[PDB]
Write a protein that binds this ligand. Sequence first.
Ligand SMILES: OC[C@H]1CNC[C@@H](O)[C@H]1O
Length: 802
Amino acid sequence: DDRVSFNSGWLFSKGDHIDAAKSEFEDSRWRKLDLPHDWAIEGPFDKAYSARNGGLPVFGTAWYRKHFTLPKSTLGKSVSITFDGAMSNTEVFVNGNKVISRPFGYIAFEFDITPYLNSPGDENVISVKLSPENYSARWYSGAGIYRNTWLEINDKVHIKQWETFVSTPTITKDKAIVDYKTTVINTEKSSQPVVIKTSIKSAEGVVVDEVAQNTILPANSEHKIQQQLKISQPRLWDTEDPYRYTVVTTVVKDGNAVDVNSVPLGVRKIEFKADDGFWLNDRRVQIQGVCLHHDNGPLGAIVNTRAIERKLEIMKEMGANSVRTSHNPPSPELVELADKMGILLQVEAFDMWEIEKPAVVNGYNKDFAQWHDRDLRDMIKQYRNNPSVIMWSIGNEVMEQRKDDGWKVAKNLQRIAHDEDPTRLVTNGLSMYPDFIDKGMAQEMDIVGLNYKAYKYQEIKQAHPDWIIVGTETSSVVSTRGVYHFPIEKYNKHESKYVTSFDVITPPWAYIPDLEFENLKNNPSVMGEYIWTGFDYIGEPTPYGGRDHGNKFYWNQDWPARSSSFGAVDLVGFKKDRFYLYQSQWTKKPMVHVLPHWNWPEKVGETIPVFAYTNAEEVELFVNGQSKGRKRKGEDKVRLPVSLRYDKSVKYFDSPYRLRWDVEYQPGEIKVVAYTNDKVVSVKTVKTADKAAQIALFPDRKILSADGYDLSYITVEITDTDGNLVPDADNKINFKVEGAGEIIAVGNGDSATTAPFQADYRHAFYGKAMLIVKSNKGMAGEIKVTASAEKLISSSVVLVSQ
Ligand SMILES: OC[C@H]1CNC[C@@H](O)[C@H]1O
């Protein structure tokens, strides 16, 4: 029967608890909460925790406990529990019996609890112990049961979870052939004659094909099944049409369906051409991808369907069409949303392999030898049916790149992926030049994944023509929303602990996106890129605190810098100037964007740089009505400083992807006019804002589901009387939520603050703050949101829960 959520009614408590694995245990005073849950985001921030991991308590022992009772109708039934993810080093007990011991924190695991249950109707206790260690992550991991949990009651004859595998070996205009595999389990102590039905269902519920198999299952047995079906005139899954079928497996026993298993099916042709990029359904699709870490800003590492959906919507708005799950298996909700939103996925399994990355002594390296096979296979088993997945990845910047025998591990890992999923190619984030060429790791990979090697694309492709190449990790330029430093120079750090939004500051291994656009244009055989990153994430405050490839783990010299600056948007999804630069390269809808803002009272009469990003042909800049020149994109190049790790002769790059003026600052307004074919196609005006005066609220969604999980992201802006955003506003805004909802978190994208994420107040960060309102489960009605700040006009908005 169909599973239910197991998230409700848990107990939680930090520290060591001897005897907490036993049913009889004094947990009466333990804190009550529902899952998913991430205790590290609750803080507080402490300088004793490395800013590389966000300066939050992402390690230490903690326990979860849940009391649950099953109906008396569960007698003679199978009962299984699935944890989609637990961070990290998880041990699970059922009525004192140990059932799970899984170190990997990004993988889903399932465990049969039928042998350990008490009698139907009597209470059961499940105990979860997590023991994450310090010095184990290069970014913020969070801590706790951060992914959803599930309980399923099944017939003793049922389909094994994650063993159903479907693919399309042959696709023509007339038909698609569907290869099928499944495993049925018979946990009965006698033989069971059953019929295993396998149906392909359209979205409208039409059985477009069906086969069956009469079989006698031996007692306490497993039976593998292979079938082949046909879909006539199949509606393809595509970036422009994410249509999916459904494969339904039914265990029929004595004429009655006793178990029903469903998996998704997307019909699409994938082809990787070594000299012509990536092809989807017989046409080339340029990979315009972004890397994302798993956390959700103020929500921490917890999964939330709406938060993930919102991130994918904002990345698609930027023009992105692909996501790389850096550097770990994603939640099932992310992959499900990517299926329905037509987003191509590169699902990555590991960060490091067995050799530790510098100063990360407690990472996955300690478990790699024992767990790499099961963890890699389980990631593939869980997501091989999702049509959004177009390739697997086995690692990222692994230390084995400079080992003589490092290629053997890559070959062995790739062999495991090919065995579990023979239908997809495998890539790997290569970074140590020229080691990954000299020592043969790149030779072993299906797809050569290059990290920050754009200026080497031509040389590498000419020496190895038959290689399939992608930029697995590109740029890594950093910036802070609303921050501008003058003059535009390539410094290393700033006193403000923020980075200029003119997008020129790069770590020694990094470069500006212009250099990636240029080398992707000059080497069209490369299928595309995955930028680092699409969203800001907690931890790795580079250039502050430290650099990833150093041998020092504590990054607290620049405290309280604890969040990243690699993102094209900030921690809550506010668009940086970087967002519009990528929109100028990845979208076709006419747009124009200008930076910086026009509030510089200490610059009257002085010269100031002005940048314009557009996908149009020309842009003319106006300052208080006076034209400052009509520039032509691609012809009037912008000289920007660079510093390339493996090419020290290059000091500057003349980018044809930006436009620059240098004008005298006078308060008033600026305006950019975008021209294509000598006619106006886009206009953007930015006025000098007056004194801060009022609050403006912008909910992205006003209609929410009353499920207790749906969220509304309410943009909070500090403006003047005319509504112009005050670029430097830092007012403390107070929030009140009445009705069928409540505050769940707040943020503002500030990378160097210790302000709480769980509070009813938040400072504006360069004019903007974010209030996350959550629905309440089972109560529908109005949700009234009020924002207040002293010396400003308050604001109110009304939402509705259904
Ligand atoms: O520029 C920072 C990136 C370097 N490459 C690995 C990523 O996870 C991240 O640390």
